[PDB]
Amino acid sequence: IVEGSDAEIGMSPWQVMLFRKSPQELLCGASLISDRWVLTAAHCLLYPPWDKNFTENDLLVRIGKHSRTRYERNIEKISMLEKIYIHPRYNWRENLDRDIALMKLKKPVAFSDYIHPVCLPDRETAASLLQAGYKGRVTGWGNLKETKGQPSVLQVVNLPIVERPVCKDSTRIRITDNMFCAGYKPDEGKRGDACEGDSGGPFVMKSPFNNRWYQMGIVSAGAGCDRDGKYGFYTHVFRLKKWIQKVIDQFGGGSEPVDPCFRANCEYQCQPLNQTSYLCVCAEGFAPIPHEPHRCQMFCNQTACPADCDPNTQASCECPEGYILDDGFICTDIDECENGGFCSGVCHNLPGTFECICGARHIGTDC
Amino acid sequence: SEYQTFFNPRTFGSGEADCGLRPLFEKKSLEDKTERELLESYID
Ligand SMILES: *[C@@H]1O[C@H](CO)[C@@H](O[C@@H]2O[C@H](CO[C@@H]3O[C@H](CO)[C@@H](O)[C@H](O)[C@@H]3O)[C@@H](O[C@H]3O[C@H](CO)[C@@H](O[C@@H]4O[C@H](CO)[C@@H](O[C@@H]5O[C@H](CO)[C@@H](O[C@@H]6O[C@H](CO)[C@@H](O)[C@H](O)[C@H]6NC(C)=O)[C@H](O)[C@@H]5O)[C@H](O)[C@@H]4O)[C@H](O)[C@@H]3O)[C@H](O)[C@@H]2O)[C@H](O)[C@H]1NC(C)=O
Ligand SMILES: *C[C@@](*)(O)[C@H](CCCNC(N)=[NH2+])NC(=O)[C@@H]1CCCN1C(=O)[C@H](N)Cc1ccccc1
Ligand SMILES: *[C@@H]1O[C@H](CO)[C@@H](O)[C@H](O)[C@H]1NC(C)=O
Ligand SMILES: *[C@@H]1O[C@H](CO)[C@@H](O)[C@H](O)[C@H]1NC(C)=O
Ligand SMILES: [K+]
Ligand code: NA
């Protein structure tokens, strides 16, 4: 968000962060619409020109977040995806027409002071509020400039809707009715925009009729960020409610040399033990895969561990399974008990996994 | 806050009826710092 400010705590409790597992990195914004459903942009998930094509196991959904980077123990909640649904007429070749996607969560999320869904507008709410010069609000963890330009905390800015003739004449791309645009004009002397990394986040408006927040759009596109006489573009949520309805109805009811090493085919490294036998060994902070011992993987006994980022890079970070990246380029264990969603029984957390006592005891499983 | 529901909770899950009302704001009769800004844009 360019020329936004820090969000107050609890200000956008429907704000959802999409988080790539491997490598560990913020992917996009999204929004929470019920305890099972998340709304976002299709290009976050799928955009072939940037080799983007994620399936469900590639991502995490983190909810109730405020800090960009801190793992917010006892506040944020991590949800896994059951399924992704991209609009079937999503036009990435040309327009980003219908830049929209739905995400169903494996389990319902627990609501709290920080986690709470947004309303989707009806015909009348849309009609009345989606009008030039009325302001909505956009939030995200994206870039602070076009040209670290990364915020430590969720950013917010309020922006007026812009009338089509002006949106239209601001760009050579064919604008459709499934979009609208927003932002100040050069002579208005305030400025503000969404920027890269804010895609999928909500454009919201507080209704003066019932005092509720409605998501009118989804951060979609623009040219640079905060350019004079340019305007950010949003997916027109109401226009696509048809489709939302249809996917939710259809899919919602769920929840020879002498060298022992010669033979080896180790992923990282061979070490000879005897003259007659070898051992596949692994880089520091790694270990062999218990049932797949020629292959290798990250490992941690402990509550936290350093991230395997790429040496010369200052990022590209991996973590072990059941850990997440954190401040200080660290992997910290996930507490699947505090989180909820992993265990109906009596839960004991464990570094990398957990224990679930089902009423027989399960390690890393429910019942 | 009169809100009719649109979706079936069998498929949508829970939350719809109390959507859009913030625990730390609307539910406590508090305004966020810039909330008013948006209100006033309607008064126009
Ligand atoms: C360098 O050099 C070597 C070269 O290879 C190398 O590796 C060796 O590896 C093994 C490890 O074992 C293997 O593990 C690998 C996985 O890494 C796996 O691929 C492989 O399949 C092997 O399991 C070391 O040996 C160790 O293993 C054995 C067993 O695990 C162990 O001792 C044995 O204990 C047995 C009992 O527990 C005992 O046998 C019992 O005998 C009685 C009486 O006969 C039987 O009783 C009844 O029998 C009747 C049938 O007649 C049945 O009807 C009844 O039901 C039986 N009774 C019951 C109660 O059921 C029992 O059934 C048993 O048969 C046996 O005699 C052994 O003493 C041993 O102590 C080891 O722990 C090797 O030592 C070696 O390391 C090295 O790794 C290389 N370098 C380095 C640095 O390590
Ligand atoms: C995916 C989002 O992070 C991002 C948001 C950009 C919002 N910008 C402003 N100023 N509000 N969207 C994009 O980067 C999209 C995805 C693919 C490329 N793209 C663009 O916005 C281009 N700058 C323009 C464009 C390219 C292709 C199709 C439509 C528009
Ligand atoms: C996306 O990835 C899946 C998984 O391999 C593949 O089946 C599909 O063809 C890909 N789609 C596109 C549009 O690249
Ligand atoms: C985890 O650490 C303990 C002691 O800290 C060690 O003995 C054990 O072998 C470790 N796990 C592995 C797979 O090495
Ligand atoms: K854990
Ligand atoms: Na602008």
Author numbering:
A (entry chain B): 16 to 162, 169 to 276, 346 to 449, 455 to 462
B (entry chain A): 2 to 45
The authors write:
Thrombin is generated upon initiation of the coagulation cascade from the inactive precursor prothrombin and plays a procoagulant role by cleaving fibrinogen to form a fibrin clot and a prothrombotic role by cleaving PAR1 to activate platelets. In addition, thrombin controls its own generation by initiating the so called protein C (PC) pathway with the assistance of the cofactor thrombomodulin (TM) and the endothelial protein C receptor (EPCR). The minimal functional unit required for PC activation has been localized to the fourth through the sixth EGF domains (TM456)1336. To overcome these limitations, we engineered proteins where the N-terminal of the EGF456 domain of TM is fused to the C-terminal of thrombin through a peptide linker of variable length.
Residues W215 and E217 of thrombin are key to recognition of fibrinogen and PAR1 but nearly dispensable for PC activation. To further reduce the activity of FP31 toward fibrinogen and the extracellular fragment of PAR1, we fused the thrombin mutants W215A and WE to EGF456 using a linker of 31 residues to generate FP31W215A and FP31WE. Correct assembly of the thrombin and EGF456 components of FP is confirmed by the X-ray crystal structure of FP31WE bound to the active site inhibitor PPACK, that reproduces the bimolecular complex of thrombin and EGF456 reported previously. Most of the contacts made by EGF45 with exosite I match the epitope validated by Ala scanning mutagenesis in previous studies. Two glycosylation sites are clearly visible in the density map, with a single sugar attached to N391 and a long chain of 7 sugars attached to N364. Although dispensable for the co-factor activity, the length of the glycosylation site at N364 is intriguing and suggests how EGF4 of thrombomodulin could steer PC toward the active site of thrombin. The linker connecting WE to EGF456 is only partially visible in the density map. Four residues attached to the C-terminus of WE remain 57 Å away from the N-terminus of EGF4, a distance that can easily accommodate the 27 residues of the linker missing in the density map. The catalytic activity of FP31W215A and FP31WE toward fibrinogen dropped 2–4 orders of magnitude compared to FP31 and a significant reduction was also observed toward the extracellular fragment of PAR1. However, activity toward PC decreased 25–160 fold for FP31W215A and FP31WE compared to FP31.
